[PDB]
Amino acid sequence: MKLDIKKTFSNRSDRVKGIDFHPTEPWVLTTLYSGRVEIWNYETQVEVRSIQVTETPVRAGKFIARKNWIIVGSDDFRIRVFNYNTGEKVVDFEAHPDYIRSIAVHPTKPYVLSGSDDLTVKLWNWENNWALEQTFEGHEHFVMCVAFNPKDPSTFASGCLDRTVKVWSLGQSTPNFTLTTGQERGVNYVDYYPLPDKPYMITASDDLTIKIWDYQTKSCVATLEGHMSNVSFAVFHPTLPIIISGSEDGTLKIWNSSTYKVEKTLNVGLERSWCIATHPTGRKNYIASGFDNGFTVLSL
């Protein structure tokens, strides 16, 4: 239960809705409510590249490092891809007839998932001219979050304001199963535990709770209570035995992933927390979070 948290870099900006770490460069991507996106080198504290993408909120953003791209989704309904070395706009298309909430990138195949207020998840194939390969229908409210299972990325999970998580197989039209979460104000976020020892998933809700699920038994393993307003996200750390959550209550919380009790609450001072990223290979155990008033990168 020993934590050593250091602030690596924090900067003020307009509301950060999406955030992501580059796997091999010391960079973080932020996507802003103002329509701007920024790539920061958090070691030198200098901007790599920034773009005014649109005038609408950009809620979702990811690196596709193996292609030197970022991919972003915005309230103008569009997915756009930029080469971060040249700034080339690679593609720009309407993906859904409504807001894009979340984007996920497959770890090996040229697949992107987008989740939308249009009640659907859509699968795009960038090696087939960004074709719409499949639409997953079944949710009954905004799809807030999509995530591939890192241990079996032929499957993915979607978290929805309809109070469910659905787990799907690529190429199949109905969910493999639906978790009725009992989080009655909806699911804002879903994440997979990344290691082989536990088949766990985690959900965050406006109902102030975080729940841990065993995806083989479909049972709720634990409920984490303590946040004082909407919980924006909750994730498992890739190297440390912790869960990190963030909330409109303005805090990040670090929870023990064995006992499911809170270990530390951080009052970041940037008002509401919206998004989170962890460094994929645990470099310096970095995490980053985006808030109303900027972002912070912390080493643990």
Partner: peptide, 5 residues
């Protein structure tokens, strides 16, 4: 109008 922020 849900989740506009």
């Amino acid at each position: 109008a849900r989740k506009l922020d």
